[PDB]
Structure formats: structure tokens, C-alpha cells
Amino acid sequence: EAARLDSELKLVGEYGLRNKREVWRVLLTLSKIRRAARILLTLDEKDPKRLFEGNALIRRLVRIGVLDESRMKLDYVLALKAEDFLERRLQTLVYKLGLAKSIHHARVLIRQRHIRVGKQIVNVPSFMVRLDSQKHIDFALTSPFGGGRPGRVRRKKAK
Amino acid sequence: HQKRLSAPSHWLLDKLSGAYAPRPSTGPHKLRDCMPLIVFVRNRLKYALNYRETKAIMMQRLVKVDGKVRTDITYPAGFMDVITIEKTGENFRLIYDTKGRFTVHRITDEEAKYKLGKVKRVQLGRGGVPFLVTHDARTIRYPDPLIKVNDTVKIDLETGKITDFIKFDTGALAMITGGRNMGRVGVITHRERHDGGFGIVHLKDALDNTFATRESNVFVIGSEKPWISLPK
Amino acid sequence: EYEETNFVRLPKESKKERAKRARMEGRSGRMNFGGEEFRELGEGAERISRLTKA
Amino acid sequence: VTLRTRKFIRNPLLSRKQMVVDILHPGRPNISKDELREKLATMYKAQKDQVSVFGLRTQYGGGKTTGFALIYDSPEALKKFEPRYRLVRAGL
Amino acid sequence: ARQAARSHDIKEKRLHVPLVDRLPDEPPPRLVVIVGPPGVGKTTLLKSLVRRYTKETMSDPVGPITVVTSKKQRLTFIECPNELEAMIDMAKVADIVLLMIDGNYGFEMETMEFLNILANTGMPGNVFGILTHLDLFKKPSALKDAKKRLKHRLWTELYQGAHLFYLSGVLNGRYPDREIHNLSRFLSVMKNPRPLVWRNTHPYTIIDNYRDITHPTKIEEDPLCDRTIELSGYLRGTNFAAQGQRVHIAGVGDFTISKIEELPDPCPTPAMEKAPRRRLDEKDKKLWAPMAD
Amino acid sequence: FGGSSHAKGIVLEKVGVEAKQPNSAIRKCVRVQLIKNGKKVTAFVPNDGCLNFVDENDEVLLAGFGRDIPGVRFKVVKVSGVGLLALWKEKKEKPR
Amino acid sequence: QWYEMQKAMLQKQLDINKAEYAELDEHQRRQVEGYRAGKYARLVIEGVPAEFCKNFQPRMPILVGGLSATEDRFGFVQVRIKRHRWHK
Amino acid sequence: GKRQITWQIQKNKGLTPNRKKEQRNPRVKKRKKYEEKQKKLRSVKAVYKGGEGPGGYQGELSGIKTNLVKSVKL
RNA sequence: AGCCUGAGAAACGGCUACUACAUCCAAGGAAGGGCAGGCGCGCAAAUUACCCAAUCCCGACACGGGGAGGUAGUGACAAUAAAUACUGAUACAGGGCUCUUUCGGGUCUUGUAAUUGGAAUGAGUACAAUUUAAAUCCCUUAACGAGGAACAAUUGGAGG
Ligand SMILES: Nc1nc2c(ncn2[C@@H]2O[C@H](COP(=O)(O)OP(=O)(O)OP(=O)(O)O)[C@@H](O)[C@H]2O)c(=O)[nH]1
């Protein structure tokens, strides 16, 4: 259908994912979380089950940084979106912090091992950066943008 | 050749001793109520690492159990057997804890010189002489004529002579060596005969908890008089 | 900590234990979306209910 | 090249000393356990022919290297207390 | 129901076209050919195969070599020389083929040429790939990567899931005996050959021994004259005519039969000798190689 | 047919080998004989450039034809054990 | 079971041959049925080139095929051909 | 002194039709198709595309048509 | 069917006779019986791998011996992650796109087999060192390693 096609393409382009396989993966985990929130809303208020499970779920979503810290209600847990998950993806986070010029520049940086998350380098761009870990995304110490050797083509030009 | 999990859970093995576990050899103590010497060295004490290392250590005359040198690897040493190691000069004794697991204690020579063993039984041996059977499978000829069944004896361990005895008594403190309430140091307060098999004692702690253990599992340690140094 | 206890190296996980933890993750209801674990909403929630009523 | 030692034990009845060695080479490749024995011989004032080492996993991200070395009181003690494979890796 | 679907699909895989068999009860030796690029050691594999089979250390094995391998059936090995004339002849006559591959060096034009010639004339009974020179590797990662990509390319060449064995070293100048033992395990227990219409309509033979019959007076009168030839071998296809048969010696030309002398085998095959035990005897492991040593 | 999905057969006669226009359905059709029944049916080769490939008396595998001679139900999928599209694309050589 | 029926007819025919000449030695088995497959045979060929006999190497094998009456006639063969896929 | 096998046989390509590099890399295809489909979007509706430029107001740069209403008639 | 040792067996380890097989021979005689693999259509697809290195077992016995145990190899049946490129400048062309309504509407920066510039590198190649019974894998890691005619993305469908 044209609606699903153009929607998946809009998501892909504005966050330059590789394929609708990755898109459907994010949609699958979004659906599972949203279903769990739906069952917790099927339970009634002030029941200990809903109280504790919903507080746990909202705390997980806040501590990974998708749900905003202002709204902490299960209706907004229902209103959580794949656009929010893709904003939490690492590649878009490099592009938004401004280490890259474009989203595909971020993708190729993450592939060829220039950024790091905290202490170890990160080779995959579908990494789900937590809100506590967002601030420590910088160039690795072995990358020519961070230091280390001047690099390959610079070497061949210096020769 | 049982598995590590099917091995008894009170001589402890971690999640890395392999799928197997040694079986104790034949000796004084029972199979379920044993701690083998290799497991005592390399799993609890960790004075070695490997089976071959423990083989070499036990092969040179370096580990002494109950005053006698023990050669083979899996000699059973179940309960209250002193283990003198002379190169460290330490003596280890095996007690239980409140949970029911083997606990090793460090002792010097003065308290390490003697043992405390429960009397299994008493009869007349060949020649018309009374002899005395401990739970250590030790037989003492010519005993004190007052030491009945389920007594306890302080044993010299150098000449094997009967140094002292403690009597089964209501109002005495004990230690449990079996049953679902195994390893709960407390005082005997009551005895119930139930003539026809399986007499019971009622034993409370020092802190108001009553429970029923059987005389066979009961092991008298002392009225107050904790003649062995319990761990603090 | 076990590795440093008696400083013996450990064999990196074998086929049996690896297949066992694989069948456990295949049978379980957990998922690791980010750094935190998410659980299914069944007997855990029922245990919460039983403990709170008790 | 830089050396740290934790968990050092005398092992008197086996007559051997067991310590966990945290050796760190910055900016170099791995440590060459022969050279490690050569260092540990004088770093704990013994003979190179009575020290051995194994374990020796290089940590993630370079830098740290966790090895386990053993110092015996005598080369003869090493000869009759070492396993054959570690003896052959040592070269005796 | 799905069991019925599986059973029907297996039977529709089982069917074929009904071709004529024409195989006699005393079957001729099946043709094992050894084909490879120059310098890959097809002669050495022939040496080590015949040593595993008849325990004879052939110093220079040439021509066809007949070996008995069961109490019922017998094989004969022919190495192909590095000329495409012998390649096409032995390709159109072969029944099971050992295709050698030179390992680290990868595939060769000789291999692909022979494979396509074979598939065009007629796909034989069995084809096996053997892969050598695996001692000439320095990293086992590169070794197993080369093995995997060569197995895949070979599968795409002939068919999905063909047998590809690997021969590592050269120990006594012979081969690893365990390696060639499992190879012989694969090529020992055999099935009836694929009944191709050309071999089952024409009678063919491979000449085991060749002798020059000429009167030396005729030799002295004309050094370049017509000589008579004694070719002794095994009649393999259909039956020859009784007289006046035309033959075409491959690479010489057409001639006629002057004389057929039928005579019993030198590899007598214990079933044919006794004309239900498993093992073969050291009475029974023979060899017939009238051109080799 | 039968209970199976792909049936084997023998090419009996490439009927319509002498048609004029190259992609005519009568040009493409091939009369075969299903082995499992001994029956005579007719199947399509997907292109005349591959009707050149199919040879007479060859173990030909055929399957359903799902979509000029409306009613021919079968189409040729394999010839002599090799995928026919690969034959036409000149990937593999036909084993005869 | 049309396949097995056709193969059983082929086997009946392959039994009828050798059952119809398992009857006489000289007349049938030597003169009628020729010289059967598998048996060892010495072939005497007359008129083979001496250049062949001088340049005979043992490596290059000798293959002998049967030329039939159709295989002995000359004429215009009309063929369906195609170049090989990998030929330049 | 050996016959190397050439690249065609090393990977049997055959007679597959020709494609593009945009088709060979599946990310770039969904970059080029998206930018093209973003371009079509500006041709039907309008995008905000920044407010007035820093230079100031330089007139409605592309025409003003009088007889055209574009409101959604409720 | 019977017997034998031994703490522990009616051991199947042996013997004894009968029966049913099979082998060698100088035709007088002699010894012997299991499991694993391949085919099982004429057409098919996971090793005939390494060591007792650790846990454990048996012995005159620290040293000898272990068919449990671990190590290795294959796999698109699935499942998991993601390469095949990133970013500038210049010159030139004026059209590119769309629709309900179509010889009719709408919207405005779009391209180029154009010309040059940047950087980044991982597949691979690989000195070593480490790992380990010995090796591999993993972690370290010097040196190489991108311009399309290549370090060579496919499968289907529609249409000129
Ligand atoms: N190291 C190693 N050497 C090999 C291997 N295979 C063959 N060789 C050597 O390469 C040589 C190849 O000789 P052949 O196999 O006889 O060559 P051929 O085609 O059989 O006979 P020719 O016509 O003489 O070439 C042998 O002599 C071996 O010494 C191998 O697998 N490993």
C-alpha cells in the first residue's frame, strides 16, 4: 500500500536507515512495549500490579531517554513513537551533536570506527544510546580527528 | 563418578570444578558425611590448584590427619578430625555452621592435641575385655566403666587414651549432625523415649527456638564447656 | 573473581552451555532493547500481586 | 612494561610463590612472556631459570594484560613441580 | 497430508527416463580417470592409490592400471596427460572422474575445460573433486577460506553438494595414507553406471597392452611400412561383431579388425572365480598393469 | 496433477517447431509425456531462445503455469537436472 | 507405475537376449553374438602407420571405438551449434 | 607458467542485464530516491524553507497571481 | 544345555557336547563367530579430525593406562549485527516536477557521460607477540591495502 510505502520511506530518508528491515525491527519493539502498556491500562488504577509494573516501565523508558522526563504517564507511554526511537538511535545522535555534516556521514563514521561511546569504540550504528550515555560521544583517540596518526591518505601524500 | 551437582551440597564446589566431582574413598566416616582430602586442600583451602599438585603434596609426608600421615588423595575426613599441616604449622578442624555446611577452623597445638569423639557403642571384646566404639571407627580397649552409648570422649590423639568423658544429659548443650534441623547448636532440654524405635530429643537453642532431633543425629559437645574452639 | 581466585584460565563457553543459554533465551519472555531489561507481564506481575496481598 | 602485583601468596608446602601480575604495555604489542620472566626474575630478586608465567590474557582496548607468574625457590623445584607442557613452553 | 506431499515430491524426484542398461553379469572394470592441470601430481595420486590397493610401490606407473576392489566389481585407473587430445578421448570414455585442483593456486583452465567437455559429451557416473597442495598454506584462516570458496565455485560448476576431498601433505612422496583411505572408502562401494546412450550403443575398449607384430624381413625391406598391431584390453560397451568390424583408434584413423582372440582375464574377480562374507583377502587383492612396472 | 507439485516427463516432440512468428504460443509449446502416469500433456518453454535449448528425449521437469492458446497448464522449469532459466541465461552447461 | 513398467520391459528384453543365445557355442556365441563385453581380448589390426609405431609413447592412451555403418558414411551434417559462454 | 582462470568464470555472471551503482548500494538508492521524492514535494505543496532571508524582504520572488484561491473550503 | 574364577557374575569372559554357519590345507588335519561406515533409483549434499591438556577412574604404584571429557572443522535451515562509499569548489545549461477536470491547471531552483579538490578507510595482505596439550578463534599489533576499465549486489515485475 502507498501509505505504508511512503511512510517507511519518509522515516528512512529523514533518518537514513539502510532498509525497511531495520524500520520493521524498530516497529516490532515499539509494538511490544506499547502492548505491555495496553495490558497495564487494562488493569485498574491503584492496583499494586499496575502501579509497580507501570512505574518500572516508565523508569526504563526515561532512563534510556525516549519518554520525556516531564510526562510520566501510561497514556504517553502509548503515545511513544518509532520516530522517538529513531531519534534515540546512535547515528542520528552523531548527526545531531554535530560531529558529522550529514546523517550518511555519521553512518560511515560509525562504520569505520571513529566515534566512541564512553571508553570503547562502537562499530554499529543501531546502538540505542541511553540518556546517561548521550553526553560522552566523541572521536576516538586513534582516529585522525581525535589525534593519533595523521592517517592513510595523509601518509601517502606526505610520502 | 557422580556429577558435581549430585555431589553433597555441604562440601562446596563452585561452578567451575567441571561436570564431575570426586567420590570419597572407603574409610572411617560415612559417604554422605565426608570431606575428602583433595577437596579440603584445593577447593576449600586452595593450598594447591590441580589434581597432580595435590597428588605431589599428599605424596610427600606433608599432610597429617588425626596425628597420622595420610598418603592417598581421597582419604575421607568427615567430622572433627584435626588436620595438622606442619609447613604452615596450622591445624584445621571441621565443624558445621547454622546452615549446615563444612566450616574449617584454625587451631594451634594445645587444643589441636586432642579430639572429641562421640561413642557409637560398647561391648566385650575377645578375651573378655570391654571395648569402646567411637563414631570415628576408633576402638578403645579397657575404657572407663561409666561410658555408655551416646557419651562423648576427649581423646589424647597421641596415645589414644581416654582423657575425659561427657555424659548425655538433659540440660546440656549439643550440636546436631543430621536431620532437617542439621547444624543448630543448642541445649538439650528434653528426652522422649518412644520405646520401639527412634527415640527423640527436644532441643532448644540459647535463644528460644524448639525443635525435635533424633538421638542418632545428636552429637554432644558439652554442657556449657565448649571444649572445641567454635568460630566467633 | 573465580579466574583470579586460583588463577586458572577458563575455557571460553562450550557448545553445551551455549546451547543451553540459547534455548533459555528462546523460551524466555525478556528483551534487551537498550541497557535495561524488559520482562513479560505474567507470573512476575502475579508474584507482585500475591506478595502485596500477603 | 609497567608492572603491578596483586594477590601474592607464598605457597610454602609447594615451595612456590603465586601472584597475579598486572603488566601494562602502552603503545607496544604484547609482552613476550620470555621477557616477562626475565623481568620478574630481578623484580623479585630470583633467577630466570626459576620463574615461569602463563595465563596472560590481553585486556580489551589494549594496555592492560593479566598474567599469572610463579617463582620457585629452586630451579630443581621448578623442574619437579612444573607440568610438562609449561616446562616445554619455558624451554627446559 | 504433508507426509503425502513429501512422499509425492520424493517420488517425482525419483523418476527418470527409461534408458537401456546393457551391462553384462561379468562386468568390465569401471574407468576411473585422474584429470588435472600440469604439475598437480595425478601420477602421485595414481601411485598412492595403487599402493593402498595392491601394496605395490610402482616407480613409474603409466597407461591403464587395473585393480580389483570388491569381490564383485573392479576398477582401472588412467591418468590423463597434459594434452587436450587425450583429455577429450578419456572424457568421452570415462565413468568416474577424479578432478584434481591445485589448492592455493585456485582453479585452472584445464579443470574448467575438462568439466565443460565432460558435461557436453556425457555426464558420467561419479565425479569427485580432490584438492591438493594444502601444505602450501601459512594461515589456516586463509586455508579454510580458500577451501570454502573453492567448494562453492565447484558446486556451481557441476552440482549442489558434490564430494570434495582434501589432501594435505606429501609424507613419503606418496600421500597421507589415512586421507587416501577415506578416499578409497568413498570410491569402493559403487553403483551401476549411468546408462548413457552412446556407450550403450557403441562397443569400445581401452588398450591395456600394445605390441608390434612385424616380420623383421619386412622391417628391413621397408622401414616405413604397414605394421600389424596386437592390442590387448577389455571389451566394454556392447558386443563386437564377429568379423569385419570397423574400428577408429583415437588419434590414428579408421581401420578394420583382422583378428579377435577372446581370452580370460588376468584380474579374475573371486565372484567370477567361484562361478557371503565381506572382507577381501590377500589372495584376492590383485593387479594388472602390462605397461607400467 | 497427481498429488505433487513438479512432475517429470520426457519430451516427445517439439510440436509447432515450424511456426513462422517467433514468440507464438504454438511455437513455444512442447508435447511431453508425464512419467508418473505415462500421460501425454503439453507444456510451454518460456522463450523460443530456450526452445533451442530443450532437446528431444530429455528428463524434463515441469510445474504449473499461473497467470494465445489459453488452457496450457504446465511450464518447463528444469531440463536434464539443470534450471532452465540458468540455461537460458548461460550460467550452466546442459549435462547430456 | 509407468516408469517401473518401462524398465521391466527393458529387463525382459535384456533377458530374452542371452536367453535366446544361451544355446550353442560356435554358431551362436562365437558367430552370432560376436565377442561379449567384459571378456579380455587381443585385437590384430593390419596396416597401422609406422610413424605411429615409432612415435608411440606409453603415456598417451589408446582408445578403440566401434565404427558403425552410419559412422562410415560421408555427407553433409546439418547441426545445431552455439558458441561457448566463456569463449572470447 | 600456468593458465590463470579469468574473472568471468571465477564468478559466473552470464547474461544478467545491466544495473546502476545506485542499485548496487542499497543505502544510496534510498538516499537518492528520498531526495528526489523530497524535490517532488516542493513542487506540489510548499515547504517553509526558512523565513525571510537575512538580506530583508526582496518581494514575493516568484509571481503573484490574482485569480487563484487556495483555501480549503469548509 | 552344563561347568569354571572371584568379596561381588549363573560374567557371555571363557571351556565342554549337540545344532546352524563360515575360513585355511600339502586333504591326514586346524582355528572361528561383535560394532561403526557407504549404497539402498541411473541423480548426490554436516568430519574416516586433535589430545588426556583440565574434572574423574584403575592398578605393586608420585611416573603406567582410560572410547567419559574438552579442543577443532562444515551451515543461507534459521536467527543476530551491517560494508559495497563520505564531503567540497568551479563551469555550463533552463527547465525539473505535478493533477480532479488534460489541446486545461499548479509550483520554483534543478541537472550534467562537465572540470578539479579534499579527507576517511575495512574486506584483504600480514611481520610478530599472545592463546593453547599443539594449534586455531578472541584480545593486542608494526607494515601495506580505493578511483569505476574497479576491492566487479542480486532477484523479480512493468515500459519505451
Ligand atoms: N608440498 C606438496 N607437493 C606436492 C603436492 N602435490 C604434488 N606435489 C609435488 O608436485 C609434483 C607434481 O608431480 P605429479 O603429481 O607427478 O605431476 P603429474 O601431472 O602427476 O605428472 P607430470 O606429467 O610429470 O606432471 C610431485 O612430484 C610432488 O613432489 C602437494 O600436495 N603438496
Ligand SMILES: [Mg+2]
Ligand atoms: Mg600421469
